Structure 1
């Protein structure tokens, strides 16, 4: 599994700030837009993009406050991310797109798709965000930690002071061991504690047992859209998974129209770090059927 990031940096200024993005493959045609989540960046897609770039333009932005993008002093609510990604997409002049999304990138991708359905040709997803009714549904190995992330005083000590989302959550949610050079790529944007605000606001925005209400409402809305939309869907899942365990992937294969599922083998949350080649090769095999 490759540890390098051989992509030339591209930057675009939107709403006063620069956003970094990978842009490879053909210069035109339908682009494939890769959206990462918490606490990652376009680095998470580095071994998947090479399977797709031979046929399609691949664009992978670093969300505002993350990766190589600038760091405005925001509270970094999901709504701030929505504003920046909406502006990024229009600044690049994108018309129709194929989405490849994960975690908070999936909440951004699905919410953008529900609002711009005529512009989405297909959605490839994995370990995505859905309304979580109770903590019972959260797996035991990670439940008490995520509860601490959402409690005062404690969640900020863990995520901002101790960097628990980078040093703990990230590697503990990859089955194979991440190496120090990979961990340093993920650590780079957050070397200064104050720059870790997005890492703490994100878990506090997850819709669980009804809160926060605004996010629950918007996630319910895109789920209803997804269950009634004929857009082609490709869902990758692992065992035991975290947000989408095996039993839930099988149920979604049924409850979502035109949905193909792919078993990646062992995996927790950052599936891209356990089987990037199967994820990339299957996306490449699936794209021509969208023509």
Structure 2
């Protein structure tokens, strides 16, 4: 169902001097849920219950996000993709996941998840994805309604828009959920970014990392790598499509529909679809996991 209550309490692990937070409930092979920008593990709160009894349910908060520690010094060079991967790879190793991991990913969580699967293919039992960064794109592929704002985040205007005005959290997030959020839900997303300044840097560094029109070249190369691999991988996949959707539409959606060994369902939503159709999403992930883990 819908609801504002988190799925569980946060557990903490020390990673490279910083404490990272994650939800970890149940037992069995992992079903790893990874949020993107400007969210946290909270994004999956109404989806994880659907997998009760199917495995160890885990949802990690990326560095500087959710209840994971902020990095200091922080500035324009902090929280780039590579730095996030460095912290997340270490946390996932620390969690002792074994080799039958089912990844459930969204947004930057999909870029990080796809990248890790390419690099640990024998340990991935299945991949469920939605509103993902499935390949490098062009501005023409970006949702029309937010094109100017994302170009502004990528310009020097980004610091005022995000560090001072907190626009990713206050405008983009609610703007890409079809239903109105309650104060408790909005408070849960605002919490890590309440303080003006560098505390909000992760929500500004992330849009500056999207592989668009070949820039930044390093992330474009990384996405090109996992896109090519996923398109040829026999790993079971579940494509949770959205209507109207946002990022995984047009060319990117056509590309994803070519991936092999894939099941598809479509749910109502824009970008943060977990807030609009959690039960339909959770039920399909549960059906997928039951096929992968015949009891």
TM bucket normalised to smaller = over 0.9
Gap regions ≥5 residues in structure 1: none
The one-character-per-residue Cα deviations of 1:186-207 (angstroms, maximum 9, x if unpaired) are: 1111111220111100000000
Alpha-carbon distance between aligned partners in 2 of 1:108 and 1:61, rounded to the nearest angstrom? 12
Look up the match of 1:70.
69
Alpha-carbon distance between aligned partners in 2 of 1:264 and 1:250, rounded to the nearest angstrom? 17
Provide TM-score, normalisation by structure 1.
0.95
Look up the match of 1:15.
16
Specify whether residues 136 and 247 from structure 1 end up closer, same or farther in structure 2 by C-alpha distance, changes over 3 A only.
closer
Specify whether residues 133 and 104 from structure 1 end up closer, same or farther in structure 2 by C-alpha distance, changes over 3 A only.
closer
RMSD: 1.3
Alpha-carbon distance between aligned partners in 1 of 2:102 and 2:87, rounded to the nearest angstrom? 19
1:278 deviation in Å? 0.6
Q: Is the 8 A contact 2:241 2:265 kept in 1?
A: yes
2:220 matches 1:216? yes
**Structure 2 SS opposite 1:228:** coil
Q: Is the 8 A contact 1:237 1:246 kept in 2?
A: no
The one-character-per-residue Cα deviations of 1:62-109 (angstroms, maximum 9, x if unpaired) are: 011000111122400111111111110111111221100000000110
Q: Is the 8 A contact 2:21 2:61 kept in 1?
A: yes
Look up the match of 1:101.
105
* Number of residue equivalences: 286
**Structure 2 SS opposite 1:256:** coil
Tell me which moved more, 122-131 or 223-232. 122-131
2:286 matches 1:280? no
Alpha-carbon distance between aligned partners in 1 of 2:284 and 2:85, rounded to the nearest angstrom? 28
The one-character-per-residue Cα deviations of 1:12-56 (angstroms, maximum 9, x if unpaired) are: 111111111101122xx3110110000000000000011112321
Specify whether residues 279 and 246 from structure 1 end up closer, same or farther in structure 2 by C-alpha distance, changes over 3 A only.
farther
2:28 matches 1:24? no
Specify whether residues 83 and 262 from structure 1 end up closer, same or farther in structure 2 by C-alpha distance, changes over 3 A only.
same
Specify whether residues 94 and 136 from structure 1 end up closer, same or farther in structure 2 by C-alpha distance, changes over 3 A only.
same
Gap regions ≥5 residues in structure 2: none
Aligned equivalent of 2:148, options 144, 151, 163: 144
Alpha-carbon distance between aligned partners in 1 of 2:273 and 2:187, rounded to the nearest angstrom? 19
Tell me which moved more, 52-61 or 121-130. 52-61
